[PDB]
Write a protein that binds this ligand. Structure first.
Ligand SMILES: Cc1nc[nH]c1CN1CCc2ccccc2C1
Length: 460
């Protein structure tokens, strides 16, 4: 039985509004309703992995697992295995996989982050799951961010706290937050960003929704605008939204948006909004294609509609050679030429690099670079031809061209990372000097750039 080079992943996010679900929720897992929907001809074809994020979930883990497993069994006639389940308050993530994947899945991690302080600590935050699928690392975050149209800045802060403090994936990757630890990272939830239009425009917005005219609403979506201004979710992608706002509905129908201020809302308006979202970030030049992104029309127990997204995702096999794992492959090497970091920092410490990759026996520390002043005020750290030659465990090009090198630039004085990024080895050529580039981030914000040339030697 051959190891896969692709899998499909289902992502669901649903704020259940503290109400039990209806008896049938299969439309969610089938990607049927509004938006980019899945073809009827695929209905019996299981996804490899289902990741379900709920918010305001009133069910026990046992109660929800029974509903999810029985749903998928009805759709596919497959009894899914539970990979992981983790709950923080009423925020939950479930990961289910086809039984044939049970011995492909390992290093399962779970964690949560509680956002806010005092007043604002006690119900918002995130849960997450990671694991290896053969040679590919996967991470999943379900976040319920701060509510309210006038709290977009708080949501951006919630985002930064979650990616700083959620402890998933390989702990040896100590300079790197979750936005660098995974081949594929999916981040979803009730992100709670709103359509920023005046309250007096509520009925005009409803009109637009009835006409399926979303353009003048999406141009005021806070998540799209904050992302465009690099305030949040830097280097994440989102599929185009072609479904109606998923919040705030009257329960038991989808015919009515309930937007007016009520004691129950703290006298806040809830203009129709795309609160419920799926974003992803994959390593450079790895196959990842969104094949659905939409909302259900027939699940009406909550004031939110469920959202689904599905993805094709490239995966690699657990490679063994005569040599690595457990030694190097003298036929393999990675060389860096003419490399320099450009940093936005005002500081004047020396810097060194760390190279981290599962193609190395352990991470590699460089010598300090040479600081120069850039023409427009910046710090340029030059490495020239000084960077160590990296010695991969396997030289086979079928393996090595699929790998990635994480780079951290660290202060000599403090050993703290000032920037993190990632370089693909999916090169146009081997034994050839080729340009490389990555942006550098720290706490998920842009801090600089790393660029230079690479020369990759494989056994071919
Ligand atoms: C430059 C680029 N290539 C693929 N994706 C991207 C980043 N995009 C580019 C355009 C854009 C517009 C609004 C909000 C976020 C983004 C992020």
């Amino acid at each position: 039985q051959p190891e896969p080079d692709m899998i499909t992943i289902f992502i669901g996010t649903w704020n259940m509004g503290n109400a039990p679900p209806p008896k049938k929720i299969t439309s969610w897992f089938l990607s049927k309703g509004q938006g980019k929907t899945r073809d009827d001809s695929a209905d019996y074809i299981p996804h490899d992995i289902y990741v379900i994020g709920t918010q305001e979930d009133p069910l026990s883990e046992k109660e929800w697992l029974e509903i999810l497993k029985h749903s998928l069994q009805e759709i596919t006639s497959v009894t899914f295995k539970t990979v992981a389940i983790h709950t923080l308050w009423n925020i939950r993530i479930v990961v289910l996989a086809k039984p044939e994947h049970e011995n492909r899945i390992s290093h399962i991690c779970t964690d949560n982050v509680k956002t806010g302080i005092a007043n604002t600590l006690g119900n918002k935050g995130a849960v997450g799951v990671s694991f290896m699928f053969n040679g590919t690392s996967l991470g999943f975050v379900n976040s319920h961010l701060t509510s309210g149209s006038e709290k977009k800045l708080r949501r951006n802060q919630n985002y930064m706290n979650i990616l700083r403090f959620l402890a998933l994936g390989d702990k040896k990757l100590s300079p790197f937050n979750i936005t660098h630890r995974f081949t594929h990272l999916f981040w979803f939830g009730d992100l709670n960003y709103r359509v920023d239009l005046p309250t007096w425009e509520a009925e005009t917005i409803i009109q637009k929704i009835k006409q399926q005219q979303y353009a003048d609403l999406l141009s005021h979506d806070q998540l799209l605008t904050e992302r465009r201004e690099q305030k949040v979710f830097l280097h994440f992608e989102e599929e185009e939204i072609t479904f109606a706002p998923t919040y705030r509905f009257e329960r038991l129908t989808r015919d009515k948006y309930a937007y007016t201020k009520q004691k129950a809302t703290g006298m806040k308006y809830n203009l129709p909004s795309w609160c419920d979202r799926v974003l992803w970030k994959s390593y450079p030049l790895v196959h990842v294609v969104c094949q659905s992104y939409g909302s259900t029309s027939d699940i009406m127990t909550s004031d939110h509609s469920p959202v689904f997204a599905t993805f094709e995702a490239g995966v690699t096999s657990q490679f063994v050679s005569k040599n690595g794992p457990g030694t190097v492959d003298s036929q393999g090497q990675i060389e860096f030429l003419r490399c320099y970091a450009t940093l936005k920092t005002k500081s004047q410490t020396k810097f060194y690099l760390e190279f981290h990759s599962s193609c190395l026996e352990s991470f590699v520390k460089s010598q300090e670079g040479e600081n120069e002043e850039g023409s427009e005020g910046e710090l340029v750290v030059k490495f020239g031809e000084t960077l160590p030659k990296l010695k991969p465990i396997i030289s086979d090009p079928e393996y090595l061209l699929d790998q990635h090198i994480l780079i951290s630039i660290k202060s000599s004085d403090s050993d703290e990372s000032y920037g993190e990024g990632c370089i693909a080895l999916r090169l146009e050529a081997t034994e050839t000097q080729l340009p490389i580039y990555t942006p550098l981030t720290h706490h998920g914000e842009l801090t600089g750039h790393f660029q230079g040339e690479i020369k990759l030697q494989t056994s071919q």
